[PDB]
Design a binder for this molecule. Structure first.
Ligand SMILES: *C(=O)[C@H](CCCCC(=N)N)[C@H]1CCC[C@@H]1O
Lengths: 259, 10, 36
């Protein structure tokens, strides 16, 4: 996260780390949506242009964390994957449309003060809250400064970072880029004029864009960190997978097994 | 860069 | 069943459950046409 701040403890108990186990590295963020299911971006697992194709045994999920690099000994839980599910129409050839994947955990995590699932939006929550100008919140352990152009100024955080960003109008989104934007995406970020900055950045992909409902005070995940051009570049915006538009597939796959 | 995790996780 | 279990979703043990607010959540709520 670029221009964010350190998260408080327990501020985002659904945040998950996607961790590969050899070499040990952070791949991406993710989110806990029940005791056995994790949501992330499909491009974290599967991206043929770069010969990226992770399977279950390649990966660990780490839940309950705050420190990026510490093994957080009586706090985090580490889990193994039993099944990865990518959207059958994820478009990695062109524009990362339907950039979504579900992961089944080998066995359920227990909740705690540090581990708690986020809600998924329904129609009226989506309708009400997904409006330009409304702010949501993005969290992650990715770079603090632009890294598809690998950067200094500090580099990597020690703790989970947070930033709050406005949703932007679709015309301005589509006018900022040459990429074809779909209805399964939205964009977010401040405009060049507004004074404030901030963005997700490398290593943040796959993580939650969340909003808090003013009607029932619950946190809902509205987006997944999906893509962008650079990090925090003026006149560019982050793009997020639209979680409500792909909710039938999510329900479908967690109903089919589903046991 | 990461601290060592327990070998029951690999 | 209820949700996927929860039901309890999106209420954080250390914040909403204890009626405590985080440092920046007012910024979000104030952008939602403030409210009143
Ligand atoms: C994910 O970590 C990044 C980009 C996420 C931030 C995009 C932005 N809002 N500037 C992906 C970029 C290429 C592969 C990475 O997974």
């Amino acid at each position: 996260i670029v221009e964010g701040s350190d998260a408080e403890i327990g501020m985002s108990p659904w945040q998950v780390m996607l961790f590969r186990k050899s070499p040990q590295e952070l791949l991406c963020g993710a989110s806990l949506i029940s005791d056995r299911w994790v949501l992330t971006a499909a491009h974290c697992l599967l991206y043929p242009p770069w010969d990226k194709n992770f399977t279950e045994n390649d990966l660990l999920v780490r839940i309950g964390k705050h420190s990026r690099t510490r093994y957080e000994r009586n706090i985090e839980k580490i889990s193994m994957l039993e099944k990865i599910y990518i959207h059958p129409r994820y478009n990695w050839r062109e524009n990362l449309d339907r950039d979504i994947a579900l992961m089944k955990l080998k066995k359920p995590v227990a909740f705690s003060d540090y581990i708690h699932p986020v809600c998924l939006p329904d129609r009226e929550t989506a309708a009400s809250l997904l409006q330009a100008g409304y702010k949501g919140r993005v969290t992650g352990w990715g770079n603090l400064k632009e890294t598809w152009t690998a950067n200094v100024g500090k580099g990597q955080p020690s703790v989970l970072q947070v930033v709050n960003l406005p949703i932007v109008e679709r015309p301005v989104c589509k006018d900022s880029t040459r990429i074809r934007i779909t209805d399964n995406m939205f964009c977010a970020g401040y405009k060049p004029d507004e004074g404030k900055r901030g963005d997700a950045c490398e290593g943040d992909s796959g993580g939650p864009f969340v909003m808090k409902s003013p009607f029932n005070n619950r946190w809902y995940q509205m987006g997944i960190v999906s893509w962008g051009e650079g990090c925090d570049r003026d006149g560019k915006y982050g793009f997020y997978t639209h979680v409500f538009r792909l909710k039938k597939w999510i329900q479908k796959v967690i109903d089919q097994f589903g046991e | 860069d990461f601290e060592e995790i327990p070998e029951e996780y690999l | 069943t209820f949700g996927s279990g929860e039901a309890d979703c999106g209420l954080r043990p250390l914040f909403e459950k204890k009626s405590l607010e985080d440092k920046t959540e007012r910024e979000l709520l104030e952008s939602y046409i403030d409210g009143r």
